[PDB]
Ligand binder design. Structure first.
Ligand SMILES: [Cl-]
Ligand SMILES: [Cl-]
Ligand SMILES: [Cl-]
Ligand code: NA
Ligand code: NA
Lengths: 189, 202
């Protein structure tokens, strides 16, 4: 459904995911989450240690889903450049999907700016994994180490995810794919 | 000073704002909302740190939303001034793009950088009907129009694709500038801008 995608626990996690992703975090109270999840507050605390734990579980779901999708993209082509293209296509398919609302991690970090906050740490860990992954792919496309190119590809991805819910998603996706082709060309020379 | 707080717009704002109480309110809201976020920061925090009563707040602003919009308006004015000054600093269309890019980098590298004020606000105000969302889109469209018009003057084409590309790099740079080594972010961004300039020139 969304780009990264006990019955009571599943309803809680699914509801928190949907609402936090679409609407934001601080503005969304556990009373609304429990009401929409059709559980009580006591049931929420039976599964999660509080709102913070629930937020982290939401982000963990997103992390796991994205990792699976990026891994599947890497599995979809035997060629390093084909794998980069497949990752880029996955990103676009998310951007153009109904209910796209930007990067879950960039949206969370806007609200959790203290670097040592667990939400902030989760954001940085996910981002570093993604940077490492695309850097490694690009290192296999050309003779160089892919380090500068990886940063470049991440910059394009960050701008695409940010603008995809603020500007025509078809146009954002077109610009992003052209940018990716340019990075692939750049490293091949 | 925050990245959007230049001498010209700040001085002109001061001339428009003879109330010291109003100035403390706006300065306090700007500092805290920018650094920390918006929903998590109550008007009770702003009045305390602005050293005014709640009744003084409401004498100057109609509520929290009015104050948020005033903060974003000052950021908008400050960035417009900086970008327009950057365009004034070079007579050449490509030099103007490079100057705008240097202005962006200067902000990213500045102490207290905490990302794009507008991207951070819209993360918290996703409802397109909300005045904060509308303000963010208005600022962004002005910026896209501005760089598209510059790029249209660098090469023979209309600069439309190039302008969207430059905005994508800018958005990525602002988003990552507080999440990654700002010097490395700046280097990547400037290299990207050079690539866009080359692309439009053929
Ligand atoms: Cl109001
Ligand atoms: Cl002017
Ligand atoms: Cl600027
Ligand atoms: Na925080
Ligand atoms: Na870093």
């Amino acid at each position: 459904n969304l780009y990264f995608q006990s019955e009571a626990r599943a309803r809680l996690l699914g509801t928190a995911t949907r609402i936090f992703y679409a609407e934001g975090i601080h503005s969304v109270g556990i009373d609304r989450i429990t009401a929409e999840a059709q559980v009580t507050r006591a049931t929420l605390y039976r599964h999660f240690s509080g709102k913070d734990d629930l937020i982290l579980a939401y982000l963990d779901q997103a992390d796991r889903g994205i990792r699976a999708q990026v891994t599947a993209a890497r599995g979809s082509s035997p060629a390093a450049d084909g794998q980069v293209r497949a990752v880029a296509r996955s990103i676009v398919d998310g951007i153009r999907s109904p209910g796209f609302r930007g990067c879950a991690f960039l949206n969370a970090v806007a609200e959790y700016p203290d670097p040592a906050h667990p939400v902030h740490r989760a954001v940085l860990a996910h981002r570093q994994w993604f940077l490492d992954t695309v850097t490694e792919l690009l290192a296999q496309v050309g003779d160089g180490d892919g380090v500068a190119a990886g940063r470049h590809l991440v910059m394009l991805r960050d701008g695409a995810m940010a603008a995809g819910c603020l500007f025509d998603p078809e146009l954002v996706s077109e610009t992003f794919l052209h940018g990716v082709e340019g990075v692939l060309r750049d490293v091949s020379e």
